[PDB]
Symmetry: none
Subunit: 237 residues, 2 copies
Amino acid sequence: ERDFPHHDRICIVKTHGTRQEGDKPEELDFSQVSGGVAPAIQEEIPGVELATRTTLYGTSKMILEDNKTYETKTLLAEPAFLDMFGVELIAGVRDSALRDNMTCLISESLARKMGGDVLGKRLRPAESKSDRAITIGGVFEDLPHNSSIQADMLLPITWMPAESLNNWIGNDRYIAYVRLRPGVSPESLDEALLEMQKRHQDMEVFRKAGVELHYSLTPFNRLRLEDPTLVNMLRIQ
Amino acid sequence: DFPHHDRICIVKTHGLDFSQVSGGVAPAIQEEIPGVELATRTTLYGTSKMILEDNKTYETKTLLAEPAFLDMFGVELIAGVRDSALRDNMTCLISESLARKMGGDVLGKRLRPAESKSDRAITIGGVFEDLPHNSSIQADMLLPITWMPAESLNNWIGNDRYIAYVRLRPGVSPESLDEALLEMQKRHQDMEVELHYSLTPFNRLDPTLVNMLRIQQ
């Protein structure tokens, strides 16, 4: 399995801090962030080559062309996801990818399960009573296995409400990936991150809840092994 | 805060829990359930571009609503006739902020969906005072819920794109109504996962894939 491009230089944004009505003080440790953070980092923080955001929808059922039903794991992503993770399309137009809200990308395995030749076909949620549908605009090479980044289907992040995308308080449902330029240590950026946080985040809301937190970059280790049961393991020997 | 905000609930579904319902629920609740002062329904259209008098284009968050929406949420009309509001499918109400953005004096002007090749138009029948900022309820433009087809509106199964708001009478607990709701459900939907209606207090302060898909442009 491939390494991601420049993998030695990819970090994720973590959040650390403390909270506090009868209950003892809590140390806060998050691996996900509010929507607003990733774009701001790319714009504002020196030494950042690229930043991008994802949010996992999860697994749900999709019906293809009004017939067969497929369980699909859906991830919401930016066009930059393709660059950040070196994702190549087997079919469809790369420039187009993940720009139109009514279109999706499907993994090579999923396309195969669907019977192949899926480009241009239409998908909708299994329980939908509408003829509105999502069009398959591309097919992407399966993402590396035994990795934290997992998706059967990719949809544009713009599906999310503008309020979420621009949020700095709570709703920490996004993973923010940051690629640094060579020679930049993640730790060096703590102060700038703070400056950025102060610019965008109303701090009042936190003090009211007795919360202090801050962001820091940590190197990204993708490894997440598939649950190693005999049943799982046997299937791939 | 909305009027009697302490007594406002929304309809949730329980089996798995959801805060939206099929089109038919709200009217039935008002009709058949004792302890209920008022009930109304809305569905979010989404954000789209509207063209004003064949000139400038404005991005507009659009919400479909009933006239009772004005009562339930205490919405004052800055301009136009309240009694007329949201009666006619071919008219809309516009927020003060949008009206201002639009250069003002917008009463009677005509709007068309940008991407539309027809010349049919919606007319601005009123301007409403901006809704509270902190709320889950947001709209630049209000359109009559009767834009939706009968098949949607009267439906009890699926297509749960509606938010149903209920104002209880004083001294009635939400919990108290679970039984009457169940009776209501049996009458309206043949029951043949288990799903049931319940009321939870509305807190003006998590999208499903179907929900998101519906409002995408």
